[PDB]
Amino acid sequence: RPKMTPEQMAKEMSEFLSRGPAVLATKAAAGTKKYDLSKWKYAELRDTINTSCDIELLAACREEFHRRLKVYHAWKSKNKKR
């Protein structure tokens, strides 16, 4: 496993999001978010994205990364403050 620290994993997620931004402003978002990736490990998602051959799947992973990153920031906020 990558055995990367929480901050390290977050940094990688941001880099992937920046590399391939996904606005999802189009209807393409619908039918894609239904995919369950929150249960996929960080390493699994990384491999999935690299091996991803579908744009829909790529967007799904990007969405999971954004949501995961958001939660991470919120968690840190609680420990850092309040």
């Binding site: 929480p6 977050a10 929150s38 249960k39 995961r68 990153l69 939660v71 991470y72 968690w75 420990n79």
Partner: peptide
């Protein structure tokens, strides 16, 4: 404890 929670957030997709 806390570290484990962060790991889950960026691994298991847990809320923390």
């Amino acid at each position: 404890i806390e570290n484990d929670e962060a790991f889950a957030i960026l691994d298991g997709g847990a809320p923390g």
